[PDB]
């Protein structure tokens, strides 16, 4: 049978419970991202032919700057560029790492590395950080008094009740879209694990490719919706 939750390495500290497996997966993706960043630093050059990681970073930064400038120029929001990029890779590397052959049989199926986005804590951390950050940006640009006023007013004043709710919806959905996309997958690949290996091999290949596709799409959508939220909250 399938299980939901059942996190491993769970511990308790400071009166709070922590999912050890989720933290470990987040740390693994974070250290991979940091290794990529430091390899760029060690091998970044403008006077010579770029490295592979340099090309990847240039492409991602150019894309994110293109989305930012098309909605809110970096003269107003230069800080959302280092954000939108990391949110991408942090999510992307988080999802694609789940494509490694790290699934085995306990007889219940288990995985050494389970995608952090499959945990509500990871997605909520990312989404609420984005929420707080772009609300702070909106407060800065419109003022603590004017920002709530323009948030409630929105584009149409008499639609005020439909505005506030949407503002509270942005984070939740921004999280739930990421979690549901990956959590669901965590069940599919577990269900595929009920097949015998000679039948199990093909469904994992088909789904894994979707997981690559959908993880890339979800990283892109998450980052782009973050940029859009910044564009909206920064006038």
């Amino acid at each position: 049978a399938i299980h939901v939750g059942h996190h491993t390495l769970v511990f308790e500290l400071f009166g709070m419970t922590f999912n050890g497996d989720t933290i470990l997966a987040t740390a693994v993706t974070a250290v991979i991202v940091i290794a990529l960043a430091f390899y760029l630093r060690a091998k970044v050059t403008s006077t010579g032919v770029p490295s592979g990681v340099q090309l990847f970073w240039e492409a991602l930064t150019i894309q994110m700057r293109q989305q930012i400038e098309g909605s809110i120029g970096m003269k107003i929001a230069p800080f959302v560029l280092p954000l939108s990029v990391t949110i991408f890779v942090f999510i992307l590397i988080s999802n694609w790492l789940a494509v490694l052959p790290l699934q085995y049989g306990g007889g219940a199926a288990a995985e050494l590395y389970k995608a952090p986005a499959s945990d509500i804590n990871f997605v909520l951390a990312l989404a609420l950080f984005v929420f707080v950050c772009y609300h702070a940006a909106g407060i800065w640009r419109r003022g603590i008094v004017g920002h709530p006023i323009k948030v409630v007013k929105g584009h149409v004043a008499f639609l005020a009740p439909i505005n506030i709710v949407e503002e509270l919806a942005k984070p939740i959905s921004l999280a739930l879209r990421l979690f549901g996309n990956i959590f669901a997958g965590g069940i599919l690949v577990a269900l595929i694990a009920m097949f015998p290996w000679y039948i199990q091999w093909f469904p994992n290949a088909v789904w894994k490719t979707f997981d690559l596709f959908v993880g890339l799409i979800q990283a892109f959508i998450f980052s782009l919706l973050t940029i859009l939220y910044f564009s909206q909250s920064m006038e």
Partner: protein, 81 residues
């Protein structure tokens, strides 16, 4: 008593996902129809249409995946059990 509630929760979650999948599939098909038509009309649109497109998908998927979240509550954490 728990069996009846479990069957009802399964049916409810099935309805949740049926609606979510209908909405997601149809809305994503419509958004992709717009994307494909725009790229056919003006090829370079390739660059600029993935921003509004993935926003639309982002709106279409939300209503789906939120439902999916509320499915997990219905199926795995049945509120009234």
């Amino acid at each position: 008593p728990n069996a009846i509630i479990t069957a009802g929760a399964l049916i409810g979650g099935g309805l949740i996902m049926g609606g979510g999948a209908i909405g997601a599939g149809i809305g994503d098909g419509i958004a992709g129809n717009a994307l494909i038509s725009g790229i056919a009309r003006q090829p370079e649109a390739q660059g600029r249409l993935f921003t509004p497109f993935f926003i639309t998908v982002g709106l279409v998927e939300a209503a789906y995946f939120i439902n999916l979240a509320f499915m997990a509550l219905f199926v795995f954490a049945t509120p009234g059990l």
